[PDB]
Ligand binder design. Structure first.
Ligand SMILES: *[C@@H]1O[C@H](CO)[C@@H](O[C@@H]2O[C@H](CO)[C@@H](O[C@@H]3O[C@H](CO[C@H]4O[C@H](CO)[C@@H](O)[C@H](O)[C@@H]4O[C@H]4O[C@H](CO)[C@@H](O)[C@H](O)[C@@H]4O[C@H]4O[C@H](CO)[C@@H](O)[C@H](O)[C@@H]4O)[C@@H](O)[C@H](O[C@H]4O[C@H](CO)[C@@H](O)[C@H](O)[C@@H]4O[C@H]4O[C@H](CO)[C@@H](O)[C@H](O)[C@@H]4O)[C@@H]3O)[C@H](O)[C@H]2NC(C)=O)[C@H](O)[C@H]1NC(C)=O
Ligand SMILES: *[C@@H]1O[C@H](CO)[C@@H](O[C@@H]2O[C@H](CO)[C@@H](O[C@@H]3O[C@H](CO)[C@@H](O)[C@H](O)[C@@H]3O)[C@H](O)[C@H]2NC(C)=O)[C@H](O)[C@H]1NC(C)=O
Ligand SMILES: *[C@@H]1O[C@H](CO)[C@@H](O[C@@H]2O[C@H](CO)[C@@H](O[C@@H]3O[C@H](CO)[C@@H](O)[C@H](O)[C@@H]3O)[C@H](O)[C@H]2NC(C)=O)[C@H](O)[C@H]1NC(C)=O
Ligand SMILES: *[C@@H]1O[C@H](CO)[C@@H](O)[C@H](O)[C@H]1NC(C)=O
Ligand SMILES: *[C@@H]1O[C@H](CO)[C@@H](O)[C@H](O)[C@H]1NC(C)=O
Ligand SMILES: [Tb+3]
Ligand SMILES: [Tb+3]
Ligand SMILES: [Tb+3]
Length: 1369
């Protein structure tokens, strides 16, 4: 049969199989890593010579040593097929090659392996002699691919080539050294010269064969087009499978070659429509023809449905479920609990407000400057100071009283006129009106002028009084109308208002009081900071209730004022209140001193939870020797909770925090407490202080005073349990905790690091339990009981396992608001659906840990990929899958227009010689007469281009290849040239996308690997790179002038501890996803966009052998026509390898330079299913980011074009401050008018007076383009317009024309373009360049126009033709 074979290979050589197997096996469990490292250092894996034998040996070992069970072994095989660990090993090599070798000066001979201790290299295990002092930049920085074994003050690193036997003795020297406790052990890799430099063959991608002619509709030669009765295709296709009775295989066989089976459907009483019944299924949940996947309730987006994305999900999910099923729950019961209604409700219901302590007490009464006092003002003197005034009657206005009950504190900036106006007009009227509210205001101090004016007003209050200070403010607003202190205005106030300033005497003239400037201003700053009452939008506090200063905040205030009054009334009727009481303190009962703090973060996503069962399984050695206070024997399930405190007992804050936890435990009988001592200094063993407390464990919480706890720590003589020390440092590494840092863990949730123990007091534990209890514990308890699993909770630790697992289930791997429509809410509404005639299951439900629910539409192209991947994941043991087929009756056009193959295996395949088999996409029995297009359906982080192919992948036909090459078999090889580093930026603290910011990617070898600019949409940016250690620096210039980037969010959205870094490392086939943070430098509202290679640069794109042949002619015409230097730029992925291999020969002959450029289409940006449309988008959407920043300007020339001009003239053409220049449509042809569609309603109404331009030739002043941020506007307008499919006929032409109102377009002389179709023959004498624009009444081909229209076209073609033969010979 005539076949097509496609294979993909990586841009880095294949690492040794041995090292790949220990990396795949030990994902991040270090115990399995070093336990296997021992085995190979024995010389145990030396007797296995072939990859198959080596692989075979690992299976026996893992099973025998208890590392893996059937479920985990099956998962290991699939991940090993995927070759997931290969980029992780290459990271070591790139790091070693670029940072180790240039920092290790000297002559290396015999130093294959060497430890690095105190910046000294030792080539021998005996450690007697040191070769050198390794350069400055410290290699002791712990980075992503590192592993640590044991605890030790000294840090030792071994760079080894594991392959040879020379490794074994070196390892044992440091393994034992770590076992003793002298130093902590870690292994780094060295590129092994025993292995060959063969490239790596990859899998986990898909190949598509797209039909490029779909117009026809009314073994295989061509698909037979049938009369347009498309409507039943999905419905009949679904039945075919149900009938088969081997349904999974049928769907795969049908869905892969679907276009070929279209006419074969609808035959022999085909419908069998019993499943018209299952549209009762449609009537309750999903619309017809929609593809939806669930993994234990989790709704997955399309990006997560690849082999890599799915393997990582199972890994995380199993850890979660296994933890649950150790309490006697079936996998089925466990999943049902995770996706329960009460659980999802809690995530939705975690948005409630509270009150905060607005008082002066902390700042010793020197920050709030009140305009009122209702108890002593001689305005309210007439009114009654009675409680019953509030409680009784009241109309609709406000009840008058002489008492302190309602307060309002508003922070005001004295530099800003609008802010000052609020106090003078707003606040004062309320005073005069005798409103029963006390009005206060605190100045904001963000600038120098503001600081001074706070001093001025504060001083004026202190000696002279409120009215005098008031007077300065009033006068300043009307009289001077600016913030800055005015003495011309100030002195007038003192002139009259300076009468008898009582109390402490006046000082006058200049203020720099050590107390007044320092204490008052810094105390004010302490109040604003404490309650986060400043920034872009300040915060007003009414009765401790935050109301941001926006819109009509007084309307919001009045609503709470009435609601607080009704709250006082009800307490009065119950007799709670008395005449001797401070009424404002009724609200302050549950108020917190600090607003935000790690417990109630304003960023709702900021949260970290750990698997509790995991904590007591991995660290059993540690957690069975920690001081434990069991929760009371006679307490209720609702009262139950588990708390663990991590603290540095060698610091006051560390031991203070534990005293508060012990205090809290005395009060709450239901809590079960654990104490973990985490010290900063490793000189003394951590086990001693833990042993001191476990002896006093019985006597715990009998500490009348704090000293009793302090003394207990110091007394006693103990023997260091070094086994305890080892499990302790493993716990911190697993939990991402630094040494000497304080943390608090209630039911898995971590808060910290605690810098000061005053932040977390006994009262803070009580609210932490109260809120945590509500959100996580109560929804678990209800849901659990609803299922009848409430027998399985046997204690506080037993309960924490369940609540901690369900909290981890609702934390997304992908932060909300950046990818697509799929939140972190596990649904269960598909369980209601009837399943008899649309569903089929694979795997045992009783034993399965993983439950997949796929809802696939057979007529969809997306379904083709889904089926192929799901079949391979179904082959895994312990996985259950259930499939639902839902087709649509709405089919206006052909449903599937392509053939599909997925390259993926569930277990590795081996050679006749035992080597690992490479994987390929082989299509057999391909129709001989159909024209096809080859496409790669590659994971989102991948950048792929064709490397080996002699055929036109854009125009494939077997009949032509047979008649030209003699073979019916086509083979093509692609290269995974780059892997993406992509991220989503944000400004700090007022989080906005910093657009126009420039970035530079670097390595220790070269400081300029790559460069890109930040986009407006999601602060998006990307880099093309391979495995290794990189760094991101802001480009020198305006970017570094305005900003400083605190972090690149390499761990997650965060901020997570340990991420205050600018280092990026890629060690995965999923690339690197980043969430960087940038904070503006001192007092800036600046913008980059506004100011405070070769002589000629031409770029183009071609999508066929003909268009590439025409592109060769275009470049040659330029060269013959200019006495200048030219550089050509190409869109890399749309070109053939035949063209790619030819250009150096064109460059040598014609004397030009060339560079390949590309950018991957963003995930947020709207895709193009039609390749020709993709190409058009590449010319207009990514102009600012496709070319390096160093390029001033570029010119686009179409492939079909020919140029007779010296192209420099276009560069020198004045653009009059416009970012890009285009040439207009020809008017010169007299009788062509009918086909001039840009004089019709839509185009003439829109283009009022502006021209209709041509995208065949144009100039882009790139520096101005980026400066104007034109690209962002093009992209968002495209995305918005693209919702309607008939929006842009030719987007390349239509987008600049639709944006010429918004973005200026410089218009070019029409000498710059000629086209026979629209320009007269007389015009061509003065023509500079010629486009071969379409017919449009005829079908004459481009080859015909070229020879007839231009006589020198053949001369150029002959030159290329003989050179191609000259190269071939
Ligand atoms: C990451 O990588 C690792 C790589 O190895 C993966 O593999 C796992 O490794 C760990 C070690 O790192 C293995 O851990 C085993 O833990 C057992 C714990 O079981 C005890 O505790 C439970 C608590 O619920 C209890 O139910 C059990 O009965 C059992 O016992 C306790 O019971 C009481 C309650 O705790 C307690 O009062 C009692 O004193 C007793 O504790 C004793 O044993 C403790 C063992 O650590 C010891 O610390 C105590 O001081 C006390 O002596 C543990 O029992 C296992 O030890 C085995 O190890 C040898 C192999 O069997 C054997 O020589 C030992 O004698 C001991 O045998 C005991 O268990 C068997 C039954 O299994 C029994 O027949 C014997 O009579 C003995 O009681 C291990 O230390 C773990 O097993 C590895 N596999 C798995 C599948 O987890 C790890 O999985 C990777 N991570 C992930 C996420 O995959
Ligand atoms: C007026 O009303 C209050 C109601 O709030 C009456 O109760 C007493 O109020 C005081 C506070 O003003 C309470 O003191 C507090 O006690 C707790 C412990 O319960 C302690 O933690 C606090 O630090 C503070 O000391 C007091 O307990 C409370 N009850 C009694 C019996 O005094 C108050 O009695 C009323 N006034 C009169 C004179 O009746
Ligand atoms: C690229 O550069 C070359 C060199 O400057 C340009 O060549 C030009 O071609 C004309 C052909 O008639 C030259 O004229 C001849 O000069 C010789 C000098 O010995 C003389 O003997 C002949 O009788 C005749 O006059 C001319 O010198 C030369 N330079 C210029 C400036 O015209 C070539 O045209 C350039 N290409 C393009 C497209 O501009
Ligand atoms: C369809 O198949 C055969 C065709 O002859 C017929 O005997 C049978 O009754 C039909 N069944 C249905 C359900 O239409
Ligand atoms: C499922 O089928 C039964 C058949 O009796 C029907 O009563 C029920 O309403 C159906 N439910 C759905 C959701 O289709
Ligand atoms: Tb002491
Ligand atoms: Tb303290
Ligand atoms: Tb053209």
């Amino acid at each position: 049969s005539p076949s097509i074979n496609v294979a993909l290979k990586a841009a880095f050589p294949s690492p040794p199989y041995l090292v790949e197997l220990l990396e795949t096996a030990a994902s991040d469990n270090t115990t399995i890593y070093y336990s296997l490292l021992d085995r190979i250092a024995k010389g145990h894996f030396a007797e296995a010579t072939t990859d198959k034998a080596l692989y075979e040996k690992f299976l026996e070992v893992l099973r025998d040593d208890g590392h893996m069970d059937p479920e985990a072994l099956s998962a290991f095989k699939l991940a090993l097929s995927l070759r997931t660990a290969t980029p992780r090993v290459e990271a070591h090599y790139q790091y070693y090659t670029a940072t180790v070798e240039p920092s290790l000066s000297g002559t290396q001979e015999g130093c294959d392996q060497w430890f690095l201790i105190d910046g000294e290299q030792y080539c021998s295990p005996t450690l007697d002699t040191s070769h050198g002092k390794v350069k400055g930049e410290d290699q002791l920085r712990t980075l992503p691919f590192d592993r640590k074994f044991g605890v030790g003050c000294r840090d030792v690193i071994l760079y080894a080539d594991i392959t040879s036997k020379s490794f074994a003795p070196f390892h044992e020297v440091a393994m034992d050294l770590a076992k003793k406790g002298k130093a902590s052990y870690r292994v780094r890799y060295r590129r092994s010269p025993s292995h060959s430099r063969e490239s790596l063959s990859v899998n986990g991608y898909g190949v598509e064969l797209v039909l490029k002619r779909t117009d026809y509709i009314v073994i295989a030669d061509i698909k037979p087009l049938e009369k347009s009765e498309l409507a039943a295709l999905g419905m009949k296709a679904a039945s075919f499978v149900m009938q088969s009775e081997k349904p999974f295989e049928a769907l795969l066989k049908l869905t892969q070659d679907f276009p070929k089976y279209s006419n074969s459907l609808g035959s022999q009483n085909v419908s069998a429509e019993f499943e018209a019944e299952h549209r009762g299924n449609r009537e309750v949940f999903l619309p017809e023809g929609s593809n939806v996947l669930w993994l234990n309730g989790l709704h997955l987006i399309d990006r997560q449905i690849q082999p890599f994305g799915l393997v990582d999900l199972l890994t995380r999910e199993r850890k979660l479920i296994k933890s649950v099923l150790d309490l006697g729950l079936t996998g089925q019961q466990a999943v049902d609990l995770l996706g329960h209604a009460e659980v999802a409700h809690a995530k939705s219901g975690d948005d409630e407000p509270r009150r905060f302590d607005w008082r002066d007490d902390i700042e010793e009464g020197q920050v709030i400057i009140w305009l009122n006092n209702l108890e002593k003002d001689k305005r309210y003197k007439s009114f009654s100071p009675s409680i019953w005034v509030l409680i009784h009657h009241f109309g609709h206005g406000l009840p008058q009283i002489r008492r302190d009950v309602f307060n309002l504190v508003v922070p005001v900036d004295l530099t800003k006129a609008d802010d000052v106006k609020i106090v003078v007009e707003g606040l004062l009227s309320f005073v005069k009106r005798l409103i029963p509210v006390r009005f206060g205001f605190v100045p904001l101090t963000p600038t120098g002028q503001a600081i001074d004016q706070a001093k001025v007003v504060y001083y004026l209050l202190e000696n002279y009084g409120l009215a005098a200070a008031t007077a300065y403010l009033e006068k300043s607003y009307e009289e001077q109308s600016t913030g800055q202190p005015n003495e011309r205005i100030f002195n007038e106030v003192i002139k009259d208002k300076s009468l008898r300033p009582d109390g402490v005497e006046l000082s006058f003239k200049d203020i720099f009081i050590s107390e007044k400037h320092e204490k008052q201003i810094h105390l004010s700053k302490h109040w604003v900071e404490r309650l986060r009452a400043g920034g872009d939008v300040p915060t007003v506090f009414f009765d401790g209730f935050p109301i941001p200063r926006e819109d009509n905040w007084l309307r919001v205030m009045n609503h709470r004022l009435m609601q607080d009054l009704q709250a006082l009334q009800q307490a009065g009727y119950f007799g709670m209140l008395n005449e001797s009481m401070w009424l404002p303190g009724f609200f302050l009962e549950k108020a917190l001193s600090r607003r935000n703090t790690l417990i109630f973060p304003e960023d709702k996503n900021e949260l970290t939870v750990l698997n509790v069962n995991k904590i007591y399984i991995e660290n059993h050695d540690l957690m069975s020797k920690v001081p434990v206070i069991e929760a009371s024997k006679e307490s209720t399930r609702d009262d139950w909770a588990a708390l663990t405190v991590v603290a540095d007992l060698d610091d006051i804050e560390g031991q203070e925090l534990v005293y508060y936890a012990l205090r809290f435990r005395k009060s709450n009988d239901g809590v079960r407490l654990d104490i973990v001592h985490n010290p900063k200094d490793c000189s003394r063993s951590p086990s001693v202080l833990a042993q001191r407390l476990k002896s006093r464990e019985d006597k715990l919480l009998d500490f009348t005073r704090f000293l009793d706890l302090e003394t207990a720590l110091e007394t006693g003589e103990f023997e260091p349990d070094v086994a305890y020390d080892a499990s302790l440092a493993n716990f911190l590494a697993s939990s991402n905790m630094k040494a000497g840092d304080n943390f608090v863990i209630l039911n898995g949730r971590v808060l910290g690091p605690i810098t000061s123990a005053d932040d977390f007091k006994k009262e803070d534990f009580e609210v932490f339990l109260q809120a945590e209890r509500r959100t996580r514990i109560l929804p678990v308890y209800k849901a659990l009981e609803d299922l009848g699993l409430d027998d399985k909770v046997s204690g506080p630790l037993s309960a924490a396992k369940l609540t901690s697992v369900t909290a981890l289930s609702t934390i997304s791997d992908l932060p909300q608001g950046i990818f697509d429509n799929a939140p972190t809410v596990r649904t269960t509404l598909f369980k209601q659906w009837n399943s008899t005639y649309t569903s089929f299951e694979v795997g045992d439900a009783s034993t399965a840990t993983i439950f997949f629910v796929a809802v696939i539409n057979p007529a969809s192209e997306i379904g083709q990929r889904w089926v192929a991947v799901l079949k391979v994941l179904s082959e895994l043991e312990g996985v259950h899958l259930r499939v639902f087929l839902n087709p649509t009756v709405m089919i206006e056009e052909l449903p599937v227009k392509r053939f599909y193959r997925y390259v993926l295996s569930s277990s590795p395949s081996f050679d006749e010689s035992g080597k690992v088999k490479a994987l390929s996409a082989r299509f057999t029995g391909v129709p001989r007469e159909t024209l096809l297009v080859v496409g790669m359906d590659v994971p989102p982080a991948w950048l792929v281009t064709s490397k080996v192919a002699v055929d036109d992948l854009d125009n494939l036909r077997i009949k032509d290849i047979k008649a030209k090459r003699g073979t019916e078999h086509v083979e093509a090889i692609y290269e995974l040239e780059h892997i993406l580093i992509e991220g989503h930026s944000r400004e700090i603290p007022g989080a906005h996308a910093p657009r126009g910011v420039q970035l530079v990617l670097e390595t220790e070898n070269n400081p300029h690997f790559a460069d890109t600019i930040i986009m407006a949409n999601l602060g998006y940016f990307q880099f093309k790179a391979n495995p290794g250690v990189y760094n991101i620096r802001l480009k020198e210039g305006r970017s570094s002038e305005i900003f400083t980037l605190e972090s690149v969010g390499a761990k997650g959205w965060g901020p997570i501890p340990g991420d205050d870094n600018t280092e990026v490392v890629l060690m995965d086939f999923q690339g690197t996803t980043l969430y960087p943070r940038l904070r503006r430098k001192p007092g800036m509202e600046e913008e980059d966009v506004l100011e405070p290679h070769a002589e000629i640069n031409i770029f183009s794109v071609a999508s066929g052998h003909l268009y590439e042949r025409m592109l060769n002619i275009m470049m040659a015409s330029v060269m013959h026509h200019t006495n200048h230097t030219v550089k050509f730029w190409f869109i890399e992925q749309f070109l053939s390898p035949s063209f790619k291999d030819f250009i150096p020969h064109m460059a040598a002959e014609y004397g030009f330079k060339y560079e390949m450029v590309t950018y991957k289409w963003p995930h947020w940006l709207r895709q193009q299913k039609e390749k020709q449309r993709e190409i058009w988008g590449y010319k207009i959407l990514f102009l600012d980011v496709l070319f390096p920043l160093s390029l001033d300007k570029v010119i686009f020339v179409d492939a079909d074009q020919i140029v007779r001009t010296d192209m420099y003239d276009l560069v020198e053409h004045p653009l009059d401050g416009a970012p890009y220049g285009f040439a207009p449509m020809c008017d010169s042809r007299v009788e062509m008018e009918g086909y001039r569609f840009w004089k019709t309603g839509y185009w003439a109404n829109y283009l009022k007076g502006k021209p209709y331009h041509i995208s065949a030739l144009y100039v882009v002043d790139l520096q101005r383009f980026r400066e104007l941020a034109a690209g962002d506007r093009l992209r968002q307008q495209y995305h918005a317009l693209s919702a309607d499919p008939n929006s842009l006929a030719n987007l390349d032409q239509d987008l600049p024309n639709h944006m010429q109102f918004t973005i200026p377009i410089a218009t070019l002389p029409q000498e710059w373009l000629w086209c026979e179709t629209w320009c007269s023959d007389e015009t061509l004498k003065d023509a500079r360049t010629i486009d071969l624009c379409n017919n449009p009444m005829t079908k004459e081909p481009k080859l015909d126009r070229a020879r007839r229209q231009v006589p020198e076209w053949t001369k150029y073609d002959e030159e290329i033709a003989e050179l191609a033969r000259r190269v071939r010979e």
